[PDB]
């Protein structure tokens, strides 16, 4: 049973789960990934690797990608994970000097992986491998764009350090546009991609339906995770979550912010909803008859349908994995699967 603040009867009834046929090999090859590439303690890894359901949650998701592909980006996806677990410990122990020498070396390393990949930052390393692999899939035009919309995430990681330092809990709407880069909106967006096999060109992913609907499923994504984890992120002293700018800038109490942030999820729905129609409409008008045609419309048809599929994959994530079980930890400002 989903807690009653979290619970939407409509993804539970309207958004049926999926689940990749790789899923069992990927939930094995990410955990030994983690172990080769030293990204988490062997005891840490056997303990609580497969119950963050990391790979669950990319499975749920990319449906249809290539098991090549759905590997690279669930290992990316997993470092990412590890990555969010450094920085929160590099402001909880003020290792400024650290931080800013790890995001020098990720903007390095995200325009030249090969040459990390032996890197002595494990987490360098772990991220230059998984790069390299994204990166081989492709045309160069896309491994640019990803390389440039992930300078922007590491550039937002940065704003939340000085944030968080500081004291400061962002304003409402200067925290909608930095989630949208600290969620990392546009590489979950690029990854449908190599997932159904094609570079879109950008008259093609730049279509209006193609872009809002990406962007909705984003935006309940995040949105849907502030919610969920805003009591592991109160008691680890996070102030990046919408429901904290609104308790900070908008006096409202607890309950009112659940309550707002949860209104403003189910908004994301219904309006992705109208906008999925038009989506899947374009995606019939490409298919003209051509051979290019039929390509670019299966693509957009396989990513909306994938844009569909974060929905419900990110919403029982959030009642499934370890993550966010803040209630069984003995402190809970150090979630137990961090390394401090
Ligand atoms: C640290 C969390 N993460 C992805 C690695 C950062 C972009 C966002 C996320 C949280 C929960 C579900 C899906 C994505
Ligand atoms: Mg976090
Ligand atoms: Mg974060
Ligand atoms: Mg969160």
């Given at each position: 049973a989903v807690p009653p603040s979290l619970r939407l009867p409509v993804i539970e009834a309207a958004f049926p789960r999926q689940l990749h046929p790789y899923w069992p090999k990927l939930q094995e090859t990410t955990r030994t990934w983690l172990l080769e590439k030293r990204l988490m303690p062997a005891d840490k890894v056997?303990?609580?690797?497969?119950?963050?359901?990391?790979?669950?949650?990319?499975?749920?998701?990319?449906?249809?990608?290539?098991?090549?592909?759905?590997?690279?980006?669930?290992?990316?996806?997993?470092?990412?994970?590890?990555?969010?677990?450094?920085?929160?410990?590099?402001?909880?122990?003020?290792?400024?000097?650290?931080?800013?020498?790890?995001?020098?070396?990720?903007?390095?390393?995200?325009?030249?992986?090969?040459?990390?990949?032996?890197?002595?930052?494990?987490?360098?390393?772990?991220?230059?491998?998984?790069?390299?692999?994204?990166?081989?899939?492709?045309?160069?035009?896309?491994?640019?764009?990803?390389?440039?919309?992930?300078?922007?995430?590491?550039?937002?990681?940065?704003?939340?350090?000085?944030?968080?330092?500081?004291?400061?809990?962002?304003?409402?709407?200067?925290?909608?546009?930095?989630?949208?880069?600290?969620?990392?909106?546009?590489?979950?967006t690029d990854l449908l991609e190599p997932s159904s096999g094609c570079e879109l060109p950008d008259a093609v992913r730049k279509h209006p339906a193609y872009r809002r609907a990406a962007l909705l499923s984003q935006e309940f994504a995040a949105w849907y995770n502030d919610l969920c984890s805003l009591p592991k992120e109160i008691a680890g002293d996070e102030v990046h979550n919408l429901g904290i700018s609104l308790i900070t800038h908008h006096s409202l109490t607890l309950e009112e912010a659940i309550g707002e942030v949860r209104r403003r999820v189910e908004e994301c729905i219904t309006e992705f909803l109208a906008v999925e129609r038009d989506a899947l409409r374009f995606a019939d008008e490409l298919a003209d008859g051509t051979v290019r045609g039929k390509e670019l419309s299966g693509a957009v048809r396989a990513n909306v349908g994938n844009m569909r599929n974060w929905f419900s994959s990110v919403y029982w994530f959030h009642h499934e994995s370890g993550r966010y079980m803040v209630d069984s930890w003995d402190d809970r400002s150090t979630p137990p699967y961090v390394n401090n």
């Amino acid at each position: 049973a989903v807690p009653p603040s979290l619970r939407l009867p409509v993804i539970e009834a309207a958004f049926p789960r999926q689940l990749h046929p790789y899923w069992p090999k990927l939930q094995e090859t990410t955990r030994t990934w983690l172990l080769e590439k030293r990204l988490m303690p062997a005891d840490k890894v056997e303990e609580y690797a497969d119950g963050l359901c990391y790979t669950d949650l990319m499975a749920g998701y990319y449906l249809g990608a290539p098991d090549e592909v759905l590997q690279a980006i669930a290992d990316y996806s997993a470092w990412f994970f590890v990555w969010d677990d450094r920085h929160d410990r590099d402001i909880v122990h003020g290792r400024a000097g650290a931080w800013r020498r790890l995001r020098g070396l990720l903007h390095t390393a995200l325009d030249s992986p090969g040459d990390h990949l032996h890197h002595e930052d494990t987490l360098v390393a772990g991220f230059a491998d998984s790069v390299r692999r994204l990166y081989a899939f492709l045309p160069a035009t896309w491994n640019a764009r990803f390389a440039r919309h992930f300078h922007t995430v590491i550039e937002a990681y940065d704003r939340e350090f000085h944030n968080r330092t500081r004291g400061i809990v962002p304003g409402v709407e200067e925290y909608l546009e930095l989630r949208r880069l600290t969620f990392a909106h546009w590489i979950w967006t690029d990854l449908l991609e190599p997932s159904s096999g094609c570079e879109l060109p950008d008259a093609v992913r730049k279509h209006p339906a193609y872009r809002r609907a990406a962007l909705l499923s984003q935006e309940f994504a995040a949105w849907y995770n502030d919610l969920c984890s805003l009591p592991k992120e109160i008691a680890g002293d996070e102030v990046h979550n919408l429901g904290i700018s609104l308790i900070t800038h908008h006096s409202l109490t607890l309950e009112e912010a659940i309550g707002e942030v949860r209104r403003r999820v189910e908004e994301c729905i219904t309006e992705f909803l109208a906008v999925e129609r038009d989506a899947l409409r374009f995606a019939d008008e490409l298919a003209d008859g051509t051979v290019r045609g039929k390509e670019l419309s299966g693509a957009v048809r396989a990513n909306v349908g994938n844009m569909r599929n974060w929905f419900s994959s990110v919403y029982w994530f959030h009642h499934e994995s370890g993550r966010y079980m803040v209630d069984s930890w003995d402190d809970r400002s150090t979630p137990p699967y961090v390394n401090n």
